[PDB]
Design a protein around this ligand. Structure first.
Ligand SMILES: [Mg+2]
Ligand SMILES: [Mg+2]
Ligand SMILES: [Zn+2]
Length: 884
């Protein structure tokens, strides 16, 4: 296992100036001819010429049109092509090769592969080496001249980077297309698409230069009518980057292409973005509401890669520089487009659940790691989502005006993470009106792993009208740093007058730079309730040390969506932790009788208050009636007994339900007209995020009412199944799990879903997530009847991943759930190591569970590690997760 270190970076001893590709696609094989116009760099020390090349079948290789001989002049071990230095020229030379690859049987979905009837490429991060020989690293900038040939019937549409400069016929029913892309680019931004694609098109005219831009969205013929929303999102993305960042698209054409088989959401390439079908295609009739926010964000994300990618990555350790930034730009875009507070809330909810788990797991790493073995395991929620929060904090610190200045300085001057911090430091100096002000401490956000803990204590003096906020920050030591240093933590705060719910001070961002600090406020007429970390201004554990009474007041009257949301969350956690220990204590002591502390009555009253408030947001309401995610809860519990937590959740839901179920039912009925309005059902460009939030609320309330066995709720469930919206009649399936009509809706909703590839995958998720006692028997049914031996990641993930969130069933004390997923992981690892690693996600919290379940998970992981044919990808991941 070769380990790459960040501190060991050195520029290549070679230069690649021009790439001339000839990709000839045939029925059983794809022939790739490549001519590399190379040179010797100043960093050269007469070393061997080593190319990356994985799984390549060599027909012949040459230097200056002279064939090289195997063994005497070069060696190849299916991974590296080593050409001995004595046969390597000392000036400008040309390296040529012809290799054979097989996209048809490339089930790893990396490099060049075939998805259904579409040939597509995936080169990030180390995929280009699976297509042809190359110095496969992002700092190798080169020009590209690509020619693609194939059978005209099977692959009438040919796409690649740059301008299509020639189209020609080939004897035998074949055709060819030449693409020249003059601007320098790294090889992971190379792409090629071949297939029988249909499209929707539009013309975008830029804001300043008024350049006309051809926009194309591609898919297979069957689902071409699901491309409308993606096209609209693309238009929205371009306009936003123009309006907010003042950036225009540089090329004359942009292509979006959807494929059925894809490891992640999408990928960016210059002028040619390639999407997972579930993140590009949608229709009101064949998609749940989630697809619309999903497509918006993903289409936006890959577009925001364009302008930065056009002018500025030194090495893969700087991954968070382009990903953290893009996701940040993606999130700013989504918030502006959706105009809903739940958008920002959704991002925070994901970070504090998924990423916080990772950052306290053995897999914990900084957003810029010091080392890696597999680059495929580098693309984590830490690099992406914590990285985004780090990039977002720049905006919070600098403000909108100065941030755009710092951003413009970054784009114009350029790279590494330090380069971006430098540009922001320049804006920081301007804002602070001082050249001695710096952001050197801020770099610790890039190098320090783990989640910081921020705790508070307060003091108010009525006589002097003086309010003090004592802040403390702390990060637990891990395997990355023995000693943790204080970070630059921006704390957006407000002060709420508890008597009238008014703001007491203007916008304020506390700059915590030390381990602890005391912030004092004068002329505070009355004792305030602090509104801390507004908008979640820092990726930290917040310990407000407020009473439930104070939290309730914030929940009702604070202006900031997150602090309201977080206050409700904190009230829940306090209740959860209390009831958990009470349930646990009874279990450990085998008590015949015991007591549970009821849910705060005033808290329940506050929920009723907000719910019955017509001017309150529907999406926000859905959050406050829902307990915190299980993966968020586990961060606050040692040796988590999943059964006890399940009992705890059940009791708390029942407590609140016993009070508010009538309110829940009344709202479910009254919300129907606006939530399920069909006015624009066949207007595929009309998306109402507020309306979809109303359906989110209705479906959430229906779920609560179903679990509570509300009187005659089955009637509502049945009628809900007749709704035109997939979000509704799929919800009816899952909530009917507690009734004898589950399998009736099972067949009904299957018939509705089976003829759409993406919709069926949503049906699989719904079944997988169904709260059924016979869930293991049901999963077997999906395997034999629906899933079978499919190698489609969307199919495999849909069947198994939602099931892993079943607290009671997946964590069955027998370990049957752990054994099931482990078998799926090992099975998947044979053809797709990346997806196999994705399926390991349930095991990420293994050392946080009770001792018995720790043992069970560890055994299955050790079993997987003992598999003789385990991939390096999977091996490295499990080794790090099990601290071996
Ligand atoms: Mg091969
Ligand atoms: Mg990507
Ligand atoms: Zn990205």
């Amino acid at each position: 296992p070769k380990i790459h270190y960040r501190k060991d970076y050195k520029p290549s001893g070679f230069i690649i100036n021009q790439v001339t590709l000839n990709i000839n696609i045939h029925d059983q094989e794809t022939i790739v001819r490549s001519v590399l116009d190379m040179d010797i760099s100043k960093h050269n020390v007469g070393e061997d010429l080593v190319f990356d090349g994985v799984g390549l079948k060599i027909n012949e290789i040459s230097i200056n049109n002279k064939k090289l001989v195997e063994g005497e002049e070069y060696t190849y071990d299916n991974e590296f092509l080593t050409i001995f230095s004595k046969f390597v020229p000392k000036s400008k030379f040309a390296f040529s090769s012809e290799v054979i690859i097989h996209p048809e049987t490339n089930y790893a979905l990396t490099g060049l592969y075939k998805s259904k009837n579409i040939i597509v490429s995936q080169c990030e991060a180390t995929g280009f080496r699976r297509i042809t020989f190359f110095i496969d690293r992002p700092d190798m900038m080169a020009k590209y001249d690509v020619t693609v040939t194939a059978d005209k019937e099977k692959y009438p549409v040919l796409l690649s980077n740059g301008d299509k400069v020639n189209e020609f016929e080939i004897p035998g029913g074949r055709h060819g297309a030449r693409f020249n892309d003059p601007p320098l680019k790294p090889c992971y931004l190379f792409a090629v698409v071949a297939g029988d694609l249909k499209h929707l098109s539009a013309t975008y005219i830029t804001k300043y230069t008024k350049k006309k831009v051809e926009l194309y969205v591609f898919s297979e013929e069957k689902y071409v009518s699901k491309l409308q929303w993606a096209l609209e999102c693309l238009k929205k993305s371009m306009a936003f980057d123009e309006d907010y960042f003042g950036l225009e698209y540089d090329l004359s054409r942009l292509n979006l292409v959807a494929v059925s088989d894809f490891n992640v959401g999408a990928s960016e390439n210059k002028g040619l973005n390639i999407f997972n079908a579930n993140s590009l295609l949608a229709s009101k009739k064949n998609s749940i509401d989630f697809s619309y926010a999903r497509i918006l964000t993903v289409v936006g994300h890959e577009y925001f890669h364009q302008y930065t990618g056009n002018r500025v990555l030194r090495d893969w350790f700087q991954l968070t520089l382009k990903e953290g930034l893009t996701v940040h730009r993606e999130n700013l875009f989504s918030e502006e487009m959706t105009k809903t507070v739940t958008t920002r809330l959704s991002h925070v909810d994901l970070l504090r659940s998924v990423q916080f788990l990772e950052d306290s797991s053995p897999l914990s790493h900084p957003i810029r790691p010091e080392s890696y073995v597999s680059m495929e395991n580098f693309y984590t929620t830490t690099v992406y989502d914590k990285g985004s929060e780090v990039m977002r904090m720049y905006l919070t610190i600098l403000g909108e005006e100065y941030y755009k200045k710092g951003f413009d300085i970054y784009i114009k001057k350029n790279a590494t993470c330090e380069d971006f911090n430098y540009a922001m430091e320049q804006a920081y100096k301007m804002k602070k009106a001082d050249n001695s002000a710096n952001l050197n401490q801020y770099l610790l956000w890039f190098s320090q792993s783990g989640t910081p803990h921020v705790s508070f204590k307060y003091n108010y003096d009525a006589e002097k009208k003086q309010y003090s906020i004592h802040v403390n920050q702390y990060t637990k030591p891990d395997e990355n740093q023995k000693e943790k240093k204080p970070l630059f933590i921006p704390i957006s705060v407000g002060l709420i007058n508890p008597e009238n719910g008014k703001e007491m001070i203007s916008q304020t961002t506390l700059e915590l730079t030390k381990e602890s600090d005391t912030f004092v406020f004068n002329n505070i007429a009355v004792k305030p309730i602090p509104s801390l970390f507004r908008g979640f201004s820092a990726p930290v554990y917040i310990e407000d040390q407020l009473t439930d009474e104070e939290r309730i007041l914030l929940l009702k009257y604070d202006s900031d969506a997150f602090v309201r949301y977080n206050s409700c969350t904190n009230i829940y956690m306090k209740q959860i932790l209390m009831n958990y220990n009470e349930f646990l204590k009874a279990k450990n002591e085998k008590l015949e009788s015991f007591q549970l502390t009821p849910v705060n009555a005033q808290f329940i009253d506050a929920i009723k208050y907000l719910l019955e408030d017509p001017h309150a947001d529907a999406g926000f309401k859905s959050y406050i009636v829902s307990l915190p995610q299980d993966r968020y809860i586990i961060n606050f519990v040692s040796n988590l007994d999943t059964d006890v937590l399940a009992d705890t959740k059940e009791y708390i839901y029942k407590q609140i339900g016993d009070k508010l179920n009538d309110v829940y039912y009344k709202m479910f009925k009254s919300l129907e007209a606006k939530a399920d309005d069909l006015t624009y059902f066949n207007d595929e460009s009309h998306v109402d995020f507020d309306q979809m939030n109303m359906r989110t609320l209705r479906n959430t309330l229906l779920s609560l009412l179903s679990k509570a066995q509300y009187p005659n709720i089955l009637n509502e469930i049945i009628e809900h199944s007749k709704s035109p919206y997939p979000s509704n009649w799929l919800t009816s399936l899952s909530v009917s799990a507690y009734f004898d009509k589950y399998f009736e809706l099972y067949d009904k909703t299957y018939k509705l879903s089976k003829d759409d590839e993406l919709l069926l995958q949503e049906w699989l998720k719904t079944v997988s997530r169904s709260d059924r006692k016979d869930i293991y028997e049901i999963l077997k049914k999906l395997e034999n009847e629906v899933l079978k031996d499919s190698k489609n990641p969307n199919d495999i993930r849909a069947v198994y991943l939602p099931f892993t969130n079943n607290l009671r069933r997946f964590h069955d004390i027998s370990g049957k759930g752990y054994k099931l997923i482990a078998e799926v992981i090992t099975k998947t690892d044979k053809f797709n190591p990346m997806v196999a690693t994705q399926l390991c996600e349930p095991f990420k919290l293994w050392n946080k569970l009770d001792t018995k379940r720790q043992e069970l998970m560890l055994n299955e992981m050790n079993t997987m590690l003992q598999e003789p044919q385990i991939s390096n990808n999977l091996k490295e991941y499990l080794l790090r997760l099990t601290n071996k």
